[PDB]
Amino acid sequence: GSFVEMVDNLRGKSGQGYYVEMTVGSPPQTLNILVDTGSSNFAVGAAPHPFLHRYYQRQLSSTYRDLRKGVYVPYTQGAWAGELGTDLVSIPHGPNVTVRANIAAITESDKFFINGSNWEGILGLAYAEIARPDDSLEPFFDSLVKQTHVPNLFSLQLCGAVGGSMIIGGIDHSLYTGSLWYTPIRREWYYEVIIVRVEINGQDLKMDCKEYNYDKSIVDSGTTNLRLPKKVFEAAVKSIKAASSTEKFPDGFWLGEQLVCWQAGTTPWNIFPVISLYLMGEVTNQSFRITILPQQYLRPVETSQDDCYKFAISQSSTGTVMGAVIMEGFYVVFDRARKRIGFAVSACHVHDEFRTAAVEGPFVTLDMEDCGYN
Template sequence: MVFVVLIVIQTILFLNRAICDEFNLSGEAGQAYALEVHVGHPPQKLNVLVDTGSATLAIASYPRKENDIYFHTVSSSSLINSGKQVQAKYSQGNWSGHLASDFISFPSLHLVPEVRSDIALITKSHKFFMNGSGWQGLLGLAYLPVAAWGDNAVVGPWLDFVDKIQKKPMSFLLKLCGTQSQTNATHYGSFKMFGDDNVKPDNNFVFRTPILRKRWYEVGVLSVRLLNYTNTKKDVINNMEKDRNDTHGVSNIDIESCRELNSEKSIVDSGTTSITLPNKIFRQVVDELKGAAQNSNMLILDEFWYRGEAACWPEPQEWSLPWIGIDLLSYEADNQYFTLEIPSQNFMRVVTANNNSGGTGTVSEFCYKLGLEASGKETVLGYTAMEGLQVLFNRSAGWIGWQESDCGSNARVTGPYNASTSLLLVCSLTRPLPDVNVSIKAAQWTLCVISIVAAAVLVYLLAPCVKMFLIKPLPIAQQISLSQAALVEQENA
C-alpha cells in the first residue's frame, strides 16, 4: 500500500513538474508574459517580463506603491554594485538606476546554468511598472546596441553572458498561448532555450524571416491587411486547402504601404501588447474592421476602434470578424514571403472577465480592447501577433522562425509565395548588416588605433614641457655662477 502511495506521489510530482516546465510564462491582461527568476546569493525569487524589444535585465531595487516585492540589494552577498548610473526609455515609461552584476538563474530553464551577469538595479521609474503588475523587472532578449546605458557604462545583455559560459550561441523559443478560456483574462505560455547547434531549419520551421538589423529584432513587414474569411469552420477549411505555392506579382504587395511600414523600423516585440502600425495603415485596417462589424450588426463605438477604450458586455463574445494577414519577407529568398494569419480572437482582446452568474446579485462583465494601435511611423508586432504560434529566435544566424502551435488560438502561417522581383529592393528594406559582435570588435579596434595615434601626437606636442619636468632643475644661484664662469673663460680665450 505504501509503495502504491509513493508511486502516486511521484507521478503527481512528475506531472506537476512537466506542466510547470511546459508553461513557465504567465501574465494578466495587457501585461505581457512574465518568467520566474532567481537573483543573488542567497537567491531572491522575482518575476521578469520576457521582452524581445529591449536588451537589458533590469529589476526593481526599491519598494513601490503598486508592488512591495523588489530585489533587496543588502541581502545578496554576491552583488557587485558599480555605482555607475544607467537609464532606459521606452515607448511607455522610463527608469534609471545603477549598473551592477550578480548571479542569475531561471529554475524552469534546466539547460541554462546559473551565470554572473550584468543587471540594472532600478532605483527610480516613471510609468514603467504597471498598476497591479505581477512582475518586478524585465528580461531583455535583443542585441547589445539597444542595451541600457549611462556615463561610461553599458549593461551587457544576460544572453551574451550565457553564450560566453556555454561557449556557444543560444537561441530561444516563445510559445505564447493567450488566455485559457473566454471567461479568463490570464494568459500563459512557455519560454525555452537551445544551443544553436541544436537548431536546424526543418519541416517545422520552414517559415523564416531574416533579422535585417541586429539591434531590436528588425524584420521586413511587407503588408498588413484583412483576409477575406472569418472564424467560421468553413472559412478555415477553405483557406487550408488553398494553393500555397502560387506565384504572386509585386502588385499584390502595395509598394507605398510596404515602404511606409518599414520607414522607421519594423520589430518583433514580445514586451508590447498590440500590433502597432503607422497612422495611415492603422486607419485603413481599422476602418475595414469597423465596417465588417457593422455589416454583422455589431454596434461598437468609435472610442473602441480608434482611441483604445474598452467595450463591455454581460457575456463573453464570439467574434466573427475578418482575420488579419501580416506578410513577412522570407529568409530563403528576397523575392519570397509568407503570411501570418491572425484570428479575431487575438486582436479582440479580453481585458476583464468577471463572471458573476453564481447568484451574487452583481452583473457579469466581459470587457475587450482592440489589439491594434497607431504608432506614428514604426511597426511593432507585439504578442498579439505571436499568440497561437511558436516563434524561434536564432540570434547568431539572424532569422526568426514561425510555426503553428498546439495551444492558444488557431493562428496559422501560410506560404511561401513568390514575387516577380526582389522585395528587398522594391520595399527599400535595409539589407542584413554584419554580426553585432564583429561590428563591436571592429569599433573597439578602431577606437584603440585612434587613441594610440592621438596619444602619440599629444606626446610629441608636449615633449618640451615633459622634458623640462623630467630634468631636475639646479638651484638658481648655481646656474648663474656657471654661466658667469663660462663667459670669463670665453673672454680669456
C-alpha cells in the same frame, strides 16, 4: 521532449505581461521578470514601490558587484532610473547554468511597474546596440551565450486569454503545429523584420510595402499591441471596419478609447476579419504569411456576466511593432545563431471551431529588399 522542464515556465496576471522566474544573487533572491524582446537591459526593482511585493536587496547578496554607474531607460510606455552592477543569475525553470550578468537595480520609476501584474523586473532580450547607457553593457542573453554552452537561440510561446513557455537553447516541438517558417533578422538591434504585404480577410491593403516598415518593424514581447505607422493604421482600420460592417461600433472603439462588452460567451468573433502579415522569407523572392484572429487583436478587459474587449491594433510613429497581439498566435523562434525568426501556429493560441491562426507559404513576392527603410 528534452526541454520539458522549460515548458509552462511563463505566467501572466490578467494579461499585464508575460514573466519568468529568475534567481539573482547569493543567497538566492527569486523575482518575477517580464520577458521583453523589445529592449536589451536586465533590470529589477531594488527599492520599495507601491506595485512591488518583492525587490532585489543588494546588501544581502555576497556576490553583488557595484559598477558605480547610474542608468536610465525610457520606453514607449514608462521609464526607470537605477544603478548598475553585476551578480549571479539563474533561471530555475530555464537552462541548467548560472551566469554573472549585468543588472540594473531600479530605485525610482515612472509608470513602469504595473499594479497587479506580479512582475518585479524586466529581461531585455534584444541586442547590445539598443542597451543603455550604451552598447558596451552586455545584455543578459549575450552573457549567457558567452559564458556557457547554451546555444544562441530562444523561443517563446505566449498563451493569451495567462502563461506560456520560454525555451532557452532550443525548440520544443510540443509547442506548435505545422511547419516553422523563417524571416531574416534584418539587423541586430531590435529584432527587426521586413513586412512585404498586409491582408484583411484575404484582401490586400494595397499600400506600398515601404509604408509597412517605416521606419522599422520589430518583434516585441514587451509591447501589448500590434502597433502600425499612422498611414497604415488608418488604412487598416478602414478595411477592418468594412469587413465587419454587419455590426457598427463607435469610432473611439477603433482608437482603443472605448470598450465594447458582450454577454458572457456570446462574442461574435465571426463578424471580425482575420489579419495577415507577409514576411520576407529565407530564399530570394519567397515570402510566407502569418494570420491572426480577432481572438488575438481584441483583448479582454477584466460584471462577471459581461465580456468587455479593447481593440488592440494601435497607432505608432516609430514603425511597426509586432507585440503580444501577434506573438500570441504563434510559437516564435528567435534564432540568433542563424539571424532569423521562425513562426509556427501556437499549440496554445486562442481560436474557435471555425478559424485558426495560420502560418502559410511559400508565396512569390518581388523586390522585397526595397521594402526596408534606410
